[PDB]
């Protein structure tokens, strides 16, 4: 368990110079008692968003930069950043997943696109960094440079090994990469490979059955970009490339799994045709499944909960859009590994105003999260955070996990192109229920556009350093430690009415012009 | 009665494979208490508007299009869909009233007009759509064509049966029809009708004492337009016409008397004057009776309640407007069939302002709506419905059905032209009390302008799949159900603060724009 | 379709040349949108009419007989500074709403 303001202070005390006070209580010291604990901010009835409270400040002991940031996802997967890319198809296709996985959080990719669409951004995104490369594209010594180029075009990769029958069933004869084609001029659809290849006796490789590590250190003192690796009949049986180990040193809270691929989510309906796309994106190695829809709790996602978890039994579910404890129970009880919560939040959202149905997101955040962690599951926050304070509410109140979409819409990752709209720089964002994408075929989102913030992995650390800070003047040295703090009542609340919303931002300037942050 | 989330659930796990529960209760299961009752809700003593508050999720288990919107208007009026157009001239006349009894709702025709054109586009509501057209327009053979055409032009009918003495109780001796006038030149008021008619040894006719659907199918295998009913000495007692089985095909919905004619409301004062107004709209057919006042718990109103009921003792009775239990009960009491509720809400009223009298709307229909079911009388929740969700909401909230003003204006059915004001098409729509039509004579509304909508045939339907979405992500069947759910206490509300309504909408976006339905 | 973007009706209209719907691709068209305006079978009655009023006021019996006062100098112009454009418009009202044509 976490250790109290009072303990923390106590204990600084006893490592200077500055009795029966022990005997008194010991350990639970004097704190005069000011604000309200979360259960006596949300017992009043009212529905509560992010701004319409503040977190009162603490005890500091610890720099910023100490505070461990690490999450719960799921039951079973862990993030070391509380922060997921929102399956919407203008924030999350592959370039985007593979940018929030570097930063430490993951993204799950949007299903407005066909199941082999979505299998191979999935595939994408597993790709990206690599252990063992398995799979890597062969070519056979019949080939030609036109092949090496085109090869190169169609999936990126200039480090090709040639073996003789042109895949890894068979011996190794040479390699090809970018500086022995790079050269060549125009004459290129013509020349066999077996001219161009450095060839198997030149080669610098490893015996099968060494560790990653093993071959990482042969590869690494070689000073090669390749390390082949081959069975006792001088078979193919992997690869590994010094780009791996670059990205590695370049990207050090990487959410990675065992094979040191990219962690990887995606969306998939409650449909029939659902159960042939969810085959499609765990062939493509899916880690885990989000249910995506409105209202969660319906006889057809605890269907499909049921339907996966019999099927693919190691495979992770998130439950969909829940914003009531009556909800949730029958999802945790269906067996999902974690949920999604808010409802009618969201930046592009119109469902309270079309429905009549939603809930405050404080309120709902603080109620699902304080019955699902009864069953150990954690909780994501989706939807209506546009702001590093928001975020830290969010956790604060009791989300594992927050997911964002207008945040991180206009970055350079996020889907399609700028557009400049009205003298400003401008890219479309839309929501997936806004009939812009997909019997009167009612709307629920909106199609509305947002300021470019460049690329993920600059603001991404702006969001960390944000949450880090926020936590420091917290007295918080950890989530789980404010979490902690949040259930046992030493965290406290205030109340704001319009007023002290109105204060809390910036009053009667004239001109107002903030810069975010500086590097 | 109904069924409960928890019954629901556990029928639907009992339809799978996935003891002392029964034992312990039996049927109500555990739900975690998560919201306030509608008891809860408005014991705060604050006045609430559709705007304050929200409903929480259900449990969904069956698809949004089974949902029944069968709804009780008065105490023996049953509509289709909850659905009323308000009496205002800027609202219903004729062409609205025939539009939305149509798309299975009704119209009130207002009061600021003379009785004859009040009664005469009553009549026009009544007309058409017909079972046996008992009263049709026939000729004599000794008119010309001029004088059919002239008939065409003045009611709108081109199927004319031919008669000796030229009415409803004489030999038939042809029928004219457009096809038999059509070609014909300018030489119009010359020709006489024998010379074009298709005289009566040419005519499939139907003895008279047949039901509907025996003429309906004697019409049907004929393949003509019109089919005669005639009596043993041979003269005309009705025809009908193939027109309206097309009619009844195609609105499948529409709100229809037993003789297959759509029900039509209609406005009254409390004048003296208005006895007169009342005795010709009861010779038009009229269904219903509003009393149009701003404030009917009056001496007026109830003996105006006494006299129609004492004289017309079959006709329906709607009170004037009311917002408390106390002006219910005196209107109750003196006999009406529903009451219409609201005062101070509607779009272009100004009567809190000016009066100091009115209440917040949400409140009013509950506090209404809670008394009158003690009575077993209808409520209609009127003015201040902007969206959907406002809707279901005063469905929730226990109103049987919903009556607009500005939502039905600017459609192509409401009265008046568009006259394109500020570069936005922008058709009138004004109140009943407006001062621009009708001592000091001191104003209650305001005169404004509403944009274009196109056809209350494509506005309607959008209408009611918002309200069946609503009702899914409640968890209620039918709107009997989601009343039975706010009276028991299953269904659960939530407040809103400022902030709360701020985030359900859409948010910090640049550009913003939605498509409300795609067909 | 309509769309209803900012409480305005507002179908789309764009330009062909727009790089909306069609090496660095330089765009000539903008992708804007316009005002529900209704049937063209209402709208072109009301341009007809308003040219039929515009020859009657020059004297012209055609659109022939316009051209021809034209290429003959019968058919005078002036020209307009922009203050002469102002005064063509509408001026200092407060409020301003034209019913363009009623049947
Ligand atoms: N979280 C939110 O607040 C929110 C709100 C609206 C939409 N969305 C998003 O919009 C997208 C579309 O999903 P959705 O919200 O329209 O819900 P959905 O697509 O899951 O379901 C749409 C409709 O079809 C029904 N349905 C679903 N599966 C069915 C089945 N097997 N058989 C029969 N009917 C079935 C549902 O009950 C609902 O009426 C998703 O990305 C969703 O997350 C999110
Ligand atoms: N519901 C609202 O909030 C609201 C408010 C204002 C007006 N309106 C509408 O505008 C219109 C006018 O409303 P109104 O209340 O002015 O109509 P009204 O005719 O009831 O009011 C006429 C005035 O004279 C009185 N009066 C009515 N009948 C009388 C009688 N027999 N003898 C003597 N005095 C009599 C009334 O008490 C009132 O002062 C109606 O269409 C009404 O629905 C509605
Ligand atoms: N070839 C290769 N080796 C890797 C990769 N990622 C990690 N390793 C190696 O596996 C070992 C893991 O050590 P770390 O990199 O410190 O820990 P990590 O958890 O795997 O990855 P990070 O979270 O990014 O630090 C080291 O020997 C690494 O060089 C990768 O993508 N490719
Ligand atoms: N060469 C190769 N790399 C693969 C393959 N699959 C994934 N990769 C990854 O792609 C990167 C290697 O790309 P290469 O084309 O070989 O070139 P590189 O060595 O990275 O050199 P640069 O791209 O110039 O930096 C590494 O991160 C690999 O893990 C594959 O089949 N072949
Ligand atoms: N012909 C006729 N129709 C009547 C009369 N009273 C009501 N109607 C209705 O008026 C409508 C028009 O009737 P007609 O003019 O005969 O033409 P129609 O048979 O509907 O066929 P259309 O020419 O396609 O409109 C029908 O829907 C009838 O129900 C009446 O006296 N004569
Ligand atoms: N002539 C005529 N027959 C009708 C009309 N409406 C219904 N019918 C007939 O009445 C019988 C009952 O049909 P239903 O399907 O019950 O029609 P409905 O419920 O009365 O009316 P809808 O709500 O319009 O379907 C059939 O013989 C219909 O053809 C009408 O306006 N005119
Ligand atoms: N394991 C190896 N043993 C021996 N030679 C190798 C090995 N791997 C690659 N080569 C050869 O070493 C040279 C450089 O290979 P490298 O992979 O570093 O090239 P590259 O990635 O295209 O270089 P660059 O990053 O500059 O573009 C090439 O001629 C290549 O064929
Ligand atoms: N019951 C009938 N028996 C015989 N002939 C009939 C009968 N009813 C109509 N006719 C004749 O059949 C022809 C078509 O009549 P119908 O009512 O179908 O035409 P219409 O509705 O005016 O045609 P349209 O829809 O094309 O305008 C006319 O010559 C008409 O006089
Ligand atoms: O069209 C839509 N209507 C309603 N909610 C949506 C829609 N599309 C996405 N959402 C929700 O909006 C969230 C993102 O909200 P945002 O971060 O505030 O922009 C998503 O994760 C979804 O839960
Ligand atoms: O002039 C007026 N003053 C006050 N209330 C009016 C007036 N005319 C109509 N109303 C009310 O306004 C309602 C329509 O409100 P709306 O749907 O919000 O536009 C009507 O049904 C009447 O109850």
Same mark, same amino acid.
């Given at each position: 368990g976490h250790e109290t303001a009072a303990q923390r202070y106590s204990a600084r005390l006893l490592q200077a110079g500055y009795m029966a006070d022990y005997?008194?209580? $010991?350990?639970?010291?004097?704190? @005069?008692? +000011?604000? #309200?604990?979360?259960?006596? #901010?949300?017992?009043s009835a009212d529905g509560l968003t992010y701004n319409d409270f503040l977190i009162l400040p603490g005890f500091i002991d610890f720099i910023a930069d100490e505070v461990d940031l690490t999450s719960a996802l799921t039951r079973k997967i862990?993030?070391?950043?509380?922060?997921?890319?929102? @399956?919407?198809?203008?924030?999350?296709?592959? +370039?985007?997943?593979?940018?929030?996985?570097?930063?430490? $959080?993951?993204?799950?990719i949007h299903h407005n696109c066909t199941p082999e669409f979505q299998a191979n951004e999935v595939r994408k995104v597993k790709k990206f960094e690599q252990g063992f490369i398995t799979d890597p594209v062969v070519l056979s010594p019949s080939h030609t440079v036109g092949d090496v180029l085109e090869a190169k075009m169609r999936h990126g990769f200039s480090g090709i090994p040639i073996t003789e029958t042109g895949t890894m069933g068979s011996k190794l004869v040479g390699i090809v990469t970018s500086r022995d084609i790079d050269f060549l001029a125009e004459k290129d659809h =013509?020349?066999?490979?077996?001219?161009?290849?450095?060839?198997?006796?030149? #080669?610098?490789?490893?015996?099968? $059955?060494? =560790?990653?590590?093993?071959?990482?250190?042969? #590869?690494?003192?070689?000073?090669?970009?390749?390390?082949?690796?081959?069975?006792?009949?001088?078979?193919?049986?992997?690869?590994?490339?010094?780009?791996?180990?670059?990205?590695?040193? +370049?990207? @050090?809270?990487?959410?990675?799994?065992s094979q040191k691929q990219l962690l990887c989510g995606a969306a998939v309906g409650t449909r029939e045709d659902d159960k042939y796309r969810l085959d499609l994106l765990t062939q493509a190695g899916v880690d885990v499944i989000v249910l995506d829809s409105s209202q969660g709790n319906s006889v057809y996602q605890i269907a499909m909960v049921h339907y996966i978890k019999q099927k693919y039994p190691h495979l992770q579910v998130i439950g969909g859009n829940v914003v009531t404890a009556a909800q949730a129970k029958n999802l945790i009880d269906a067996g999902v590994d974690g949920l999604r919560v808010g409802?009618?939040?969201? *930046?592009?959202?119109?469902? !309270?105003?079309?429905?009549?149905?939603?809930?405050?997101?404080?309120?709902?955040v603080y109620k699902v999260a304080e019955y699902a962690r009864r069953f150990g599951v954690p909780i994501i926050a989706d939807g209506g955070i546009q702001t590093v304070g928001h975020?830290?509410?969010?956790?604060?109140?009791?989300?594992?996990?927050?997911?964002?979409?207008?945040?991180?819409?206009?970055? =350079?990752?996020?889907?399609?192109?700028?557009?400049? *709209? +009205? $003298?400003?720089?401008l890219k479309k964002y839309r929501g997936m229920g806004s009939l812009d994408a997909m019997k009167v075929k009612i709307a629920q989102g909106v199609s509305g556009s947002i300021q470019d913030k460049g690329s993920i992995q600059k603001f991404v650390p702006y969001l960390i350093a944000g949450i880090?800070?926020?936590? !420091?003047?917290?007295?918080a040295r950890s989530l789980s430690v404010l979490r902690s703090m949040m259930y046992s009542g030493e965290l406290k609340f205030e109340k704001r009415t319009m007023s002290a919303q109105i204060e809390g931002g910036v009053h009667g300037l004239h001109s107002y012009t903030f810069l975010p942050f500086t590097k």
């Open positions: 005997l008194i209580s $010991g350990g639970t010291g004097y704190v @005069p008692e +000011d604000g #309200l604990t979360a259960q006596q #901010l949300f017992a862990t993030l070391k950043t509380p922060l997921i890319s929102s @399956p919407m198809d203008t924030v999350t296709e592959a +370039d985007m997943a593979i940018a929030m996985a570097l930063m430490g $959080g993951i993204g799950f =013509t020349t066999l490979l077996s001219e161009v290849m450095t060839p198997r006796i030149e #080669l610098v490789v490893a015996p099968a $059955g060494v =560790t990653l590590k093993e071959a990482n250190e042969i #590869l690494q003192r070689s000073k090669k970009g390749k390390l082949p690796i081959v069975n006792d009949c001088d078979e193919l049986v992997a690869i590994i490339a010094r780009t791996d180990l670059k990205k590695n040193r +370049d990207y @050090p809270l990487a959410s990675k799994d409802m009618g939040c969201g *930046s592009i959202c119109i469902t !309270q105003e079309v429905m009549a149905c939603g809930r405050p997101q404080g309120t709902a975020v830290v509410k969010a956790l604060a109140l009791g989300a594992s996990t927050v997911m964002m979409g207008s945040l991180l819409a206009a970055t =350079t990752e996020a889907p399609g192109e700028y557009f400049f *709209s +009205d $003298g400003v720089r880090q800070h926020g936590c !420091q003047d917290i007295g």
